[PDB]
Structures are given as structure tokens and as C-alpha cells.
Design a protein around this ligand. Structure first.
Ligand SMILES: [Co+2]
Ligand SMILES: [Co+2]
Ligand SMILES: [Fe+3]
Ligand SMILES: [Fe+3]
Lengths: 314, 314
């Protein structure tokens, strides 16, 4: 019974079914929400999350993997309520999202101490519940591999070696952070096939993407719907090029959709094409249809959304 | 009725009495505590805070100012319970402690939006209660005045100009951050006498300290008890030198004691003199007695602990 699920008994990885590997039921900054609760509306967040999950299930999604962790407001009790309302298979994780330095708590603390937090969540449970973490999430972005970023990467390696759960990353597609994450993890003894290097869909530098896939890790053509990083069409072109080039067995596709996020809204940009609705089902309305009529068959779709997650969690 | 108090009616500034201007009932990283509650024990924190406050009151402390804000785990409900248990006058504040960048929430948000959070806490109340903030707290440290640090400083200026509450700072005594905070705030129209530049007691560069006091702001000879920054004796010498040099009317003394903090414990260092017990009453056991027998009279003590806080909040 490999994979722990929020609010359910654990399931064998072979039964994961059609999976969205990188979605967020909700995201927020823990410190801002604790200090200024007036900014938030949990009931609206809950309604939005339930609606999106139901829509995903209507398109045949069986399992959602939610890599919300420390820094983005992971709340296992909110997740379990969404499960109760929908019946979705939901995989929660553990980890830390930082781009520069760790919080003040971590002053004078070792990599082992950080790893112990992840292992606690995997083996004992999350936030005082018996819901266990099924993967580790880590990050790097524009600042690159800082001292503290490297500490978290190495802690994730320790957690993987002890518990065998896979690792999902956040990277910046325009620097080499994804490649660096992969290298540091594999040097620490992590199987490359247990790593998903995230946010690679943000670039059309296909050689960089192929380099990571060729080293053995899954490539996250996630953020489907955020044209800020790269338009859906260019993403689609990149996705289609990778498929016709033979990389289906390394491709993971998701939206990285946040049913509710607290980030300020950026300046809008309007293109000659009307922006597709970023949602947890955009790949069913745009990407998958775009793919199909470009010649890619059902077996490729099954590889990306079923076989690849199965392997990842196997 | 100038100064709001946690769990009490507001008091006139003239009735503040003997005040500890910079103490923490509790500190923690919001994100770490939300994600790994197993690391914390609120009942122990509560017992420790109540014990320390009671001991302070036995030495004649009437009012404690607690500059725990976003980044250090401000919790108004915990504070109100401590008030109920002790009867202390407790002044809570608003603000943000960052050293480099703001949390992800603040992407694409203006200085005005940040100021609005502080003004909400001052005028409406803290964390969904009717307990209001009586000052703004801001920080800068080893990284200096970063873009985001400057945004928070300017937001504090807006809050002060609108509400007239004073500003307490965290600075690094070994760079010019305190001087920079003072300059930026005064350029934005903040009265220098409404600013306390914190952590200046960490240095024995008296000329730097005098420079800040001479520009009109209070000088925080806080961290009494943390020999890491500077031994008590050297602090005492610095404090005594400043007094005999005429700076009593700018000096503010506190411990910056945290009844419970979640920071990892640093490598211990042992000096020929046994380390004095860092606590909220160390100045009653060491500093004030050290001062008195060095010739400083009761009027100086009243200036530092009564008249100066009165002015600050007037
Ligand atoms: Co990400
Ligand atoms: Co400080
Ligand atoms: Fe994400
Ligand atoms: Fe402090």
C-alpha cells in the first residue's frame, strides 16, 4: 500500500489512475494569513477548491497530487474537508519552498534536523493528524542555489533515501536551477526517476528540457494556463515537439493551478488570442484536444497521465 | 486615552509608569509552527511568559511593550491570556520583520497596501479582535536596506503620519542600518522623537550611538543579557558612559528577552565570569545595581524607564 491519501486508506501505486501531478487546492503565505486574517475567506477558498476538484473528476481525474508545503500554506485539515466533499484521491506532501534563506527557526540547525521534519510527516503524519506525506517538495528560483536552498535539497535526499517517497521540485526555467537540483539530488544517491523537475514548461529551450529528461528525471510541463511564463500555444508546441521526439515517458503535464492564491494580481497583458481560462481542467479543453488533432494518440495520453505517475510513485 | 492595551481599556501616556520597552512574551516562525506543531508546547510557553511577567511586576514594572510582529509569531490571543493571568499593562504592535525579501503575498503590492495593514491593526484591531496596535515595528540587519526592507520602512512612515503611533526598529549595530532607518523615516516626515532605533547596545562604538541620539531618536540599549552581541559589562560600561555624557533622555533599556523562542541553540561560549541569567529582570539584578553603585541616581533611572517611554508614546 504505497501511496498515502488524505482522509483515506493508502493505495497501491498501480491504482493511482489518471493523475494531475502538480495542483494546489489553496496557497497562501503562513505569516501573512496569521497576522492579517481579514485578507482571507476560507469559505470562498473551500467552495472554489471543491468546484475545481469536482470538474476535474468529471473529466476522469482519479488522483490529484498537491505540492503545497511550508511557505505556501499547507493545511491538511482543509485538504481533508475537500476530500470529504468530493471523494478525490489526494496526495499531500512535505517540504519547504524558499528562494533565498530559511525562516529564523532554522538558525544553527543541521540538514539532518530539516530532514527529520520531512520524515516526521512521511512516517508519523502531517500537522498532528494521521494523514501522511507521499512526496517531498523543494524549490529554487531566480537567486539560484543558495546555501539554505542547498540545505533543503540535501534534506530532501535524506528523506527519499529513508522513505523512498519521490521528490517534486519548483525551478526557474530560465536559469539552470532544475539541472542543479537534479545533479545535487543524484549525487546524494537519489534515483533520477524519483525526481520531477518542475516548471520546465515555462521555457521553449527544448535542448535544456531534453537534457534533464535524458539524465533520467521527469520533466514538469506543468504551469499550463499561465501565459506569463509561456503562452499555452508555445507550451503546446514544446509539448508536441517533445512527444514527437520520443519523450512521452518523461513528460508530466499539469496546470499548477491554485484554486485560490493570495499573491497580488499582476499587470494584465492582452494578446491577439483571447486568454484561455487558467483552471484545473484547461488541459482537457485546450492541451489534450490540441494534442489529439495534431496526431498524438490515446496511448501517449495514458503514458503521461497514468503510467508516468505510477512509475514516479512506484 | 493615547495608548491601547491588550485586554484592557486604553491608558493616557502619562500613566504608563515604569516600562520595559522591548520584550517578547513569545517568538516563533509562523510557517514553521503551522507546518510542524510537534516542535512547540504552548502550555510551556504560557507558563514561562506568566512567570516572567509576574517577576517583572514584583520589581515594579507597570507596562511591557512587546514588539512581536509578522515574522516572529505575534499572537494577540496568547497575549490577552497572559494579561488575564497577570494584570500587566501590555502594548502590542503591528509591523513586519524581514531582512531581505517580503513573503510571496506581497508580490505586485504597493507600499500603500502594506501601510494599510498596519493602519488596520492600529485603528480596527489585531487578528480579528478589538485589541489595537500601539506602535509599528520594522527591521533591517546584515543584508542592509534592500528594496523590500525600504518598502516596509516607508509603510511604517505612512502609518505613523496617519495615526501618530511611534516606531520601534530592529537594526544591526555593526553596520549603518539604524542610521539608515532613522534617515529614511525622517525624510518621509516622521518626527525623530517618535523613533526608537533598536539593538544599538550591541556595539561599543559610542560615537555611532551618539550620532543617532543626536539626530533626535531614542537609542535602544536593549538586548541586556545576550552576551553574544556584547557582554553585559561592556554594555554596562557603554550605558554608563552614555549617561555620564548626558544621553539619559535618549536611552531606552530593555532585555529583548524572549520568554520562549524557537531559534536553534547556538554553540555555547564560557567566559571567566559566569554568564548572568538572561531574563526579563536581569536589569534589576545586574544593570540597575551596577549603575547605582557607579554613581547614577534615581532620577536617571526614572528618566530611562518612565519619562522616556512617556515621551515616546506622547
Ligand atoms: Co512552483
Ligand atoms: Co530585534
Ligand atoms: Fe506549484
Ligand atoms: Fe526583539
Amino acid at each position: 500500500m504505497r501511496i498515502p491519501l488524505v482522509g483515506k486508506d493508502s493505495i497501491e501505486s498501480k491504482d493511482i489512475g489518471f493523475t494531475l501531478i502538480h495542483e494546489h487546492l489553496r496557497g497562501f503565505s503562513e505569516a501573512v494569513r496569521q497576522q492579517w486574517p481579514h485578507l482571507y475567506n476560507e469559505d470562498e477558498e473551500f467552495r472554489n477548491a471543491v468546484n475545481e476538484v469536482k470538474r476535474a473528476m468529471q473529466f476522469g481525474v482519479k488522483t490529484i497530487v498537491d505540492p503545497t508545503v511550508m511557505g505556501c500554506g499547507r493545511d491538511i485539515r482543509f485538504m481533508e474537508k475537500v476530500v470529504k466533499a468530493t471523494g478525490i484521491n489526494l496526495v499531500a506532501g512535505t517540504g519547504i519552498i524558499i528562494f533565498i534563506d530559511l525562516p529564523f527557526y532554522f538558525l544553527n540547525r543541521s540538514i539532518d534536523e530539516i530532514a527529520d521534519l520531512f520524515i516526521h510527516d512521511i512516517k508519523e503524519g502531517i500537522q498532528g493528524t494521521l494523514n501522511k506525506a507521499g512526496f517531498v517538495k523543494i524549490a529554487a528560483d531566480e537567486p539560484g542555489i543558495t546555501k539554505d536552498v542547498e540545505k533543503v535539497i540535501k534534506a530532501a535526499a535524506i528523506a527519499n533515501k529513508e522513505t523512498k517517497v519521490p521528490i517534486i521540485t519548483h525551478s526557474n526555467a530560465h536559469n539552470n536551477t532544475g539541472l542543479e537540483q537534479q545533479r545535487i539530488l543524484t549525487e546524494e544517491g537519489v534515483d533520477p526517476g524519483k525526481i520531477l523537475i518542475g516548471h520546465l514548461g515555462d521555457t521553449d529551450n527544448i535542448d535544456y528540457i531534453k537534457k534533464i529528461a535524458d539524465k533520467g528525471s521527469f520533466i514538469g510541463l506543468d504551469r499550463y494556463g499561465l501565459d506569463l511564463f509561456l503562452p499555452v500555444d508555445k507550451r503546446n508546441e514544446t509539448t508536441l515537439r517533445l512527444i514527437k521526439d520520443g519523450y512521452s515517458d518523461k513528460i508530466m503535464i499539469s496546470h499548477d493551478y491554485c484554486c485560490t492564491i493570495d499573491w497580488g494580481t499582476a499587470k494584465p497583458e492582452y494578446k491577439p488570442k483571447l486568454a484561455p481560462r487558467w483552471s484545473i481542467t484547461l488541459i482537457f479543453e485546450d492541451t489534450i484536444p490540441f494534442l489529439k488533432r495534431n496526431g498524438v494518440n490515446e496511448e501517449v495520453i495514458a503514458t503521461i497521465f497514468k503510467e508516468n505517475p505510477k512509475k514516479f510513485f512506484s
